[PDB]
Design a protein around this ligand. Structure first.
Ligand code: NA
Ligand code: NA
Length: 391
């Protein structure tokens, strides 16, 4: 029997690896569950890791290496810049290798194009995207009555941040805020966000929308704390470890929308949080839930692949993913065939002392206040989406 070989292409060492290492934790957790069950096709699934230290250029090299090593599946999620490269390299490889196609399981690169203009049959996205993140965070705040009329948008100047800004601007009229001012800044370079916080203060806003992550959110929060910023951030990634500690005195009341919260789905969500901590050493947050839940859907697909003569057929796996549905600790998870955007609930959460699971050893954690169903959460199929069917 051919074993299934899955390549994780991520930032896996060094000072920029905090997000990539959480992808590693989530991937090892869930592929670990599949392997505890026996793997796939009568063999353990092999997990081949490729430490990418070189951004998109590095990724192209690592994808070539992974495929040469026999990987039939590539997994990645920490950067949409990297994902843009991976998805195109996989698409082009597949055109040249009919019958030997490689799958790209995108567990967290959230830029719109991956299920829009760059959509293709062998890419699947298991995470939110900019539209899902920012519609849900704003609508949730509106439903709760904590969305003021004035907003600022601050994002990183690459595909992801541009998509967040465009989404926040596009939703302003219907949801009901004015984007008073907005900023795109250099990515992962700014060490002092004080001047940006000053600009936000000048705008006299109630909400600051941002898709920032890593230092671009950690240091932004720190600068906001030092300035005593009154506005609350409405985010996709505030529950990355470290942000609430950096928030210090201004921690209360900031907002995030994510696919998960330990208290959002009763005993099921909490049992998952506890099991994940038992295995990894920490409660799941930030990039981890989408990666786990996506790999749960993937595992369900694998169960539904028809027994063959021992060979692994990635087209059959792809069709099984399209057809699969699984009950995750947060509820139903499935895959939209048109664009390969996964359908799943979203939970909007506030930083509060009332949260059962605390963040960063503080008195505060993320407390859920609104859950949108899968139907309420998933974005419309993008106008730019076209997908070729087999084949
Ligand atoms: Na990600
Ligand atoms: Na369909």
């Amino acid at each position: 029997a051919e074993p299934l070989k899955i390549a994780l292409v991520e930032t896996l060492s060094g000072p920029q690896a905090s997000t990539g290492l959480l992808y590693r934790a989530a991937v090892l957790y869930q592929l670990g569950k599949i392997n505890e069950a026996g793997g796939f096709n009568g063999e353990k699934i092999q997990i081949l890791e490729y430490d990418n230290q070189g951004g998109p250029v590095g990724a192209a090299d690592r994808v070539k290496a992974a495929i040469a090593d026999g990987a039939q599946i590539i997994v990645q999620g920490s950067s949409s810049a990297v994902a843009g490269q991976i998805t195109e390299d996989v698409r082009k490889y597949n055109l040249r290798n009919k019958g030997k196609e490689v799958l790209y399981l995108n567990l967290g690169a959230e830029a719109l194009e991956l299920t829009g203009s760059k959509c293709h049959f062998y890419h699947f996205r298991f995470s939110p995207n900019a539209a899902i993140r920012f519609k849900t965070v704003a609508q949730g705040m509106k439903d709760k009555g904590i969305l003021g009329e004035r907003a600022y948008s601050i994002n990183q100047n690459y595909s992801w941040g541009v998509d967040v800004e465009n989404t926040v601007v596009a939703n302003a009229k219907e949801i009901g805020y004015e984007v008073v001012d907005k900023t795109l800044h250099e990515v992962n370079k700014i060490q002092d966000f004080s001047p940006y916080v000053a600009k936000i203060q000048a705008a006299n806003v109630d909400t600051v929308f941002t898709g920032n992550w890593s230092n671009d959110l950690l240091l932004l929060m720190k600068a906001a704390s030092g300035a005593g910023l009154k506005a609350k951030f409405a985010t996709s990634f505030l529950d990355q470890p470290g942000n609430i500690g950096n928030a210090g005195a201004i921690a209360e009341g900031h907002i995030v929308s994510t696919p998960f919260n330990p208290e959002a789905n009763g005993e099921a969500s909490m049992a998952f949080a506890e099991d994940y901590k038992k295995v990894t050493g920490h409660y799941p947050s930030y990039v981890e839930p989408a990666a786990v839940f996506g790999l749960q859907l993937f595992g369900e697909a694998l169960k539904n692949v028809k027994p063959g003569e021992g060979k692994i057929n990635t087209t059959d796996i792809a069709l099984a993913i399209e057809n699969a549905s699984v009950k995750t600790p947060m509820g139903d998870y499935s895959m939209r065939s048109d664009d390969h955007q996964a359908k799943f609930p979203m939970v909007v959460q506030e930083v509060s002392k009332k949260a059962r699971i605390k963040a960063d050893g503080t008195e505060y954690g993320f407390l859920p206040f609104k859950t949108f169903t899968g139907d309420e959460s998933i974005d419309p199929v993008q106008e730019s989406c076209s997908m070729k069917r087999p084949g």
